[PDB]
Design a protein around this ligand. Structure first.
Ligand SMILES: CCCCCCCC/C=C/CCCCCCCC(=O)OC[C@H](O)CO
Ligand SMILES: CCCCCCCC/C=C/CCCCCCCC(=O)OC[C@H](O)CO
Ligand SMILES: CCCCCCCC/C=C/CCCCCCCC(=O)OC[C@H](O)CO
Ligand SMILES: CCCCCCCC/C=C\CCCCCCCC(=O)OC[C@H](O)CO
Ligand SMILES: CCCCCCCC/C=C\CCCCCCCC(=O)OC[C@H](O)CO
Length: 496
């Protein structure tokens, strides 16, 4: 369900990314678009996922299960109304203050004033999407409360489609061509909304928004939002300051980081969705029922699974950074220089894939423990270490150093959450990790050896059509995966 539609969305997101790279490359225009659209949406996502979504899903289901459909319709009406009012005000203030928002977020764009102007213009086109995508994600949250998961998963396909179409059709018309993306995004917003509204009507939860300050449920969802806003703020501030750092770097830095991060995202989302259906449900159940012993059992199996699957992915992405970048991005305005810079950023990002997967495996269980004080402390530490690693790595490695900083920060964040579990006896690993790690290390050595060998005997990656390059890429990915799994088979792990 989710596993099929959210990954169709994934190839279309990656296809739109390749289209962007092909048509606009990695430079001033693409830098401006990323700071203008991606950075505000990421702040918005952090806020909604960290505070609004966490508060909204329990209260909504609690209405749905303990009160009628009419009471739930009224709750949803007042929630969507207050959301729309706040976001309309927020959007209006943002379009007015856009030059100051770009100045604070990306100070270094001021050196090319025309680039700063495009970033401001694109934020003005972009900003209405915040409203649209928030309404669409509220729709999707409601539908998920009604156990309809495939529609909200498929919904971002419409954004990807809209952006691809705006690039292919509207870009030559638009006077700065990447302006077209904005409108695609805009159309995308509307489409993502329009697609989900009838399904909402299907469950009788499509209702005209309405404003009130007396609703008990609205104040409940406002109260559970409170303690999470400090951590949301930490994460937002860190991301803002990272962008500030990158803004002083050479044009394309933001775009190179973006492309590397998407390349690196690609398998990590697969693994995250897959472990979120194999492991997290049973972990949540074990924590809710108070079964400590078998919670440890799953925690250990899941951490071993993380080492078994995220490590080979990270190392393979590092070894295959040029194959991947050249085969998936190096067309049109994406030059060979852009490909090298993206390769470096991708090698840097590979360090933190492990930290990402483990943060997603450990963080469920703290929000369930209702311990937010120690994660907000961990988040402040992660901020401090991130900004410090930025100062340290920016001069020597530039954008790659900023990517290394983000990666190592994710590593330390996961490590600190694990240390909190270890100190409070929340988790203690099972015996036999040592020989298990040795098995991994041998299998990784075999995999990397086979990959290096093949690459020495395989053509220059720039040479060929996209069919040819992606065929070669898939051939080496297959040989590497096969060889890693064959080394593992000799060691053991015959069944899961
Ligand atoms: C927190 C600040 C709140 C400010 C509220 C202002 C309300 C009126 C806004 C007009 C925008 C239209 C004009 C857009 C260009 C303004 C020039 C500017 O400030 O640009 C930055 C500068 O270029 C860097 O070097
Ligand atoms: C153990 C191994 C771990 C590493 C695993 C690495 C996976 C590499 C696969 C990539 C295929 C996914 C991307 C598919 C891209 C389709 C082609 C495309 O993007 O075409 C756009 C073009 O510009 C239109 O004009
Ligand atoms: C050139 C770049 C260098 C490439 C790398 C060379 C290999 C270095 C050695 C690895 C041992 C790793 C040991 C740790 C692995 C499992 C994690 C662990 O033990 O964590 C304990 C936890 O922190 C509770 O305090
Ligand atoms: C389900 C989600 C419903 C909506 C919840 C989030 C609403 C927007 C919040 C913050 C925007 C942050 C600032 C963006 C502009 C800079
Ligand atoms: C780059 C890899 C390290 C990064 C994060 C790991 C975070 C999760 C920590 C996993 C602990 C592994 C483990 O249990 O190691 C056995 C040992 O006996 C007890 O630490």
């Amino acid at each position: 369900a989710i596993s099929s539609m959210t990954m169709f969305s994934r190839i279309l997101g990656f296809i739109r990314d390749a289209i962007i790279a092909r048509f606009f490359g990695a430079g001033a225009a693409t830098d401006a678009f990323f700071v203008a659209f991606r950075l505000p949406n990421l702040l918005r996502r952090i806020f909604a996922e960290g505070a609004f979504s966490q508060a909204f899903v329990p209260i909504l289901a609690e209405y749905k299960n303990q009160q009628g459909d009419e009471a739930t319709r009224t709750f949803i009406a007042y929630v969507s109304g207050l959301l729309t009012l706040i976001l309309a005000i927020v959007t209006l203030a943002g379009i007015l203050a856009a030059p100051w928002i770009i100045y604070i977020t990306a100070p270094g764009f001021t050196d090319t004033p025309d680039k700063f102007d495009l970033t401001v213009r694109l934020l003005r086109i972009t900003f209405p999407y915040i409203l649209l995508i928030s309404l669409a994600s509220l729709a999707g949250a409601i539908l998920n409360t009604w156990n309809r998961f495939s529609v909200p998963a498929f919904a971002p396909t419409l954004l990807n489609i809209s952006m691809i179409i705006s690039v292919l059709l509207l870009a030559p018309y638009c006077e700065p061509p990447i302006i077209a993306l904005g409108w695609g995004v805009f159309a995308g917003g509307i489409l993502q909304l329009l697609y989900q509204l009838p399904y909402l009507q299907k469950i009788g939860m499509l209702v005209l928004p309405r404003i009130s300050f007396r609703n008990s449920g609205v104040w409940r969802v406002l109260k559970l939002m409170g303690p999470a806003i400090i951590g949301v703020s930490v994460s937002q501030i860190s991301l803002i300051i990272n962008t500030i750092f990158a803004s002083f770097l050479q044009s394309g830095s933001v775009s190179w980081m973006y492309y590397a991060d998407r390349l690196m995202e690609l398998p990590t989302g697969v693994l995250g969705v897959a472990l979120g259906t194999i492991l997290l449900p049973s972990l949540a159940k074990s924590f809710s029922t108070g079964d400590h012993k078998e919670y440890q059992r799953l925690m250990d199996w899941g951490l071993r699974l993380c080492f078994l699957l995220a490590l080979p992915c990270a190392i393979a992405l590092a070894i295959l950074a040029e194959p991947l970048t050249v085969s998936l991005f190096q067309y049109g305005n994406f030059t060979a220089y852009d490909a090298v810079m993206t390769q470096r950023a991708l090698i840097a990002y590979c360090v933190g894939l492990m930290g990402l997967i483990v943060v997603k495996v450990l963080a469920p269980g703290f929000y369930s423990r209702q311990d937010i004080k120690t994660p907000v402390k961990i988040a402040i530490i992660t901020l401090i270490l991130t900004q410090l690693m930025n100062l340290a790595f920016i001069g020597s490695l530039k954008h790659a150093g900023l990517a290394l900083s983000i990666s190592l920060a994710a590593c330390f964040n996961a490590l600190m959450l694990y240390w909190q579990l270890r100190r409070q006896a929340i988790f203690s690993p099972l015996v036999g990790w040592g020989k298990f790690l040795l098995k991994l290390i041998a299998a990784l050595i075999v995999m990397v050896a086979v990959l290096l060998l093949l690459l020495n005997f395989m053509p220059p990656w720039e040479q060929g059509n996209m069919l040819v390059r992606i065929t070669r890429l898939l051939l080496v990915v297959f040989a590497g995966a096969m060889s890693y799994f064959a080394a593992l088979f000799i060691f053991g792990f015959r069944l899961r």
